[PDB]
Amino acid sequence: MADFGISAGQFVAVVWDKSSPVEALKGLVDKLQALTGNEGRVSVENIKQLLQSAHKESSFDIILSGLVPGSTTLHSAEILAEIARILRPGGCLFLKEPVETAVDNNSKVKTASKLCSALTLSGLVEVKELQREPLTPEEVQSVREHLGHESDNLLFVQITGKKPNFEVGSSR
């Protein structure tokens, strides 16, 4: 539960994709379904079908996006939008995406800066990295064949962001 600050009695939506095999996915959602789905609720959505993830406004206290080892995915304003949209005020959002330390912000792939800025600008705040993961030959090929990411200055990293709740007045 400390992994994503999950709790029982809240609504947490788990977002998976091709990079998220049922082996791990089912497991991540299972534990969260027993700890969160017990008192609260747990929904499942696909990164590719994120468009349908737009259930309602501020309903999920927490949102997960590809939280597996070696995961490979790149979220954008279009995706992040839906997340935050359904993300309750004051909730949390955890996602993992490859970052490049030798390319512009936008580029062909969301970089570290672009990611943090995109998330914070997607309606989230207090965004920051939680951990760092190395690049493997089986992953790089997946992201390159799934998106087109191909570089040597790349590196997988996990980032999170908290949703702004009406009880502060920071900015957005």
Curated annotation (Swiss-Prot):
Component of the cytosolic iron-sulfur (Fe-S) protein assembly (CIA) machinery required for the maturation of extramitochondrial Fe-S proteins. Part of an electron transfer chain functioning in an early step of cytosolic Fe-S biogenesis, facilitating the de novo assembly of a [4Fe-4S] cluster on the scaffold complex NUBP1-NUBP2. Electrons are transferred to CIAPIN1 from NADPH via the FAD- and FMN-containing protein NDOR1. One of its GO terms (biological process) is hemopoiesis. In the presence of oxygen, the A site-bound [2Fe-2S] cluster is labile and the B site-bound [4Fe-4S] cluster is readily converted into a [2Fe-2S] cluster, a reason why recombinant protein is often isolated with a single [2Fe-2S] cluster. Its cofactor is [2Fe-2S] cluster; [4Fe-4S] cluster. Residues 6-172 are annotated as: N-terminal SAM-like domain. This is Anamorsin. One of its GO terms (cellular component) is mitochondrial intermembrane space. GO terms for molecular function: 2 iron, 2 sulfur cluster binding; 4 iron, 4 sulfur cluster binding; electron transfer activity; iron ion binding. The chain holds residues 1 to 172 of 312 of the full protein. The twin Cx2C motifs are involved in the recognition by the mitochondrial CHCHD4/MIA40-GFER/ERV1 disulfide relay system. The formation of 2 disulfide bonds in the Cx2C motifs through dithiol/disulfide exchange reactions effectively traps the protein in the mitochondrial intermembrane space. Monomer. Interacts with NDOR1; its oxidized form can be reduced by NDOR1. Interacts with CHCHD4 and may be a substrate for CHCHD4 chaperone activity.
